[PDB]
Amino acid sequence: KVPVVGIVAALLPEMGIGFQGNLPWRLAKEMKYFREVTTLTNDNSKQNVVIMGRKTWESIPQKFRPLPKRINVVVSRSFDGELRKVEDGIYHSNSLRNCLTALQSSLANENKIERIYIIGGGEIYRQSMDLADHWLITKIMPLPETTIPQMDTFLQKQELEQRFYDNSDKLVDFLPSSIQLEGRLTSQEWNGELVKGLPVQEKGYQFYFTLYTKKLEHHHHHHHH
Numbered sequence: 001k002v003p004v005v006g007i008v009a010a011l012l013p014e015m016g017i018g019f020q021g022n023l024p025w026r027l028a029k030e031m032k033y034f035r036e037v038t039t040l041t042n043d044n045s046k047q048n049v050v051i052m053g054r055k056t057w058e059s060i061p062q063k064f065r066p067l068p069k070r071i072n073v074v075v076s077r078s079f080d081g082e083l084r085k086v087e088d089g090i091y092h093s094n095s096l097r098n099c100l101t102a103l104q105s106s107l108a109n110e111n112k113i114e115r116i117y118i119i120g121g122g123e124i125y126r127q128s129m130d131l132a133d134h135w136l137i138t139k140i141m142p143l144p145e146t147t148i149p150q151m152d153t154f155l156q157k158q159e160l161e162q163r164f165y166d167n168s169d170k171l172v173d174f175l176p177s178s179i180q181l182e183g184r185l186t187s188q189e190w191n192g193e194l195v196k197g198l199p200v201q202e203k204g205y206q207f208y209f210t211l212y213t214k215k216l217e218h219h220h221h222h223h224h225h
């Protein structure tokens with residue numbers, strides 16, 4: 001019942017997301033977007049969840065974690081159960097899938113979660129293609145002068161485009177009401193792909209905030225008792 005949204009910043013065209021356990025760039029405006037989108041809710045009485053892999057957790061600066069004003073869940077196969085409170089603001093789960101089921105119980109969650117954001121792991125994103133209802137993808141491009149950063153972790157673009165379509169026309173409507181974005185909706189060709197969304201420039205990069213949504217599904221079967 002609660003929307004599950006993967007959120008990620010990726011450098012085109014390979015959609016690289018990381019290098020040696022860290023981000024390949026440092027972009028304050030992209031950081032600001034991530035913070036505001038994952039924090040803010042339309043309903044003042046709710047929070048969002050942010051679910052992450054152990055390795056992503058370990059890579060967030062210690063002064064900045066857990067991420068304020070959001071329910072943090074860290075997943076590790078060495079943890080004890082599906083969803084366990086370990087400290088203020090911090091849950092542990094030994095299962096991405098079972099933690100989502102647990103978070104979705106109206107009984108457990110009192111309908112006071114607005115959205116569940118999956119905020120990474122490369123490994124976590126790989127497993128999320130079949131779990132996410134949408135993706136918020138910041139598509140990053142080095143400006144002509146700009147050296148492409150080295151990268152070793154990538155979003156599965158093939159799986160993305162199999163399952164989801166570019167719904168960035170609806171990005172503004174989709175984001176929490178009180179967020180304010182600088183750009184206007186723009187469509188630009190870049191190395192032979194259409195890049196559509198809300199543009200920003202910072203340091204060596206231009207980037208677009210985009211929204212991907214699940215493609216329509218045929219009706220093959222509905223479970224009957």
Ligand SMILES: NC(=O)C1=CN([C@@H]2O[C@H](COP(=O)(O)OP(=O)(O)OC[C@H]3O[C@@H](n4cnc5c(N)ncnc54)[C@H](OP(=O)(O)O)[C@@H]3O)[C@@H](O)[C@H]2O)C=CC1
Binds near residue numbers: 053054
């Ligand atoms: N650009 C962006 O928008 C973002 C980029 N990143 C980047 O991604 C990289 C980190 O990604 P990656 O190395 O893949 O690691 P992840 O952050 O995806 O963490 C992987 C770990 O999560 C645990 N795990 C994986 N699947 C499950 C599951 N189904 N249930 C329970 N636990 C599970 C395992 O922990 P364990 O080994 O303890 O069992 C595994 O080693 C970094 O470079 C980081 O900078 C991260 C977030 C955002």
Ligand SMILES: CCCc1nc(N)nc(N)c1C#CCc1cc(OC)ccc1OC
Binds near residue numbers: 008061064118120138
């Ligand atoms: C700094 C926002 C980037 C970001 N951007 C987008 N579009 N999606 C995301 N999921 C993240 C993310 C993340 C997790 C993260 C947070 C962080 O400080 C808060 C430091 C390192 C991080 O991962 C290595």
Ligand SMILES: [Mg+2]
Binds near residue numbers: 080092
């Ligand atoms: Mg535990």
Ligand SMILES: [Mg+2]
Binds near residue numbers: 094098
């Ligand atoms: Mg699992």
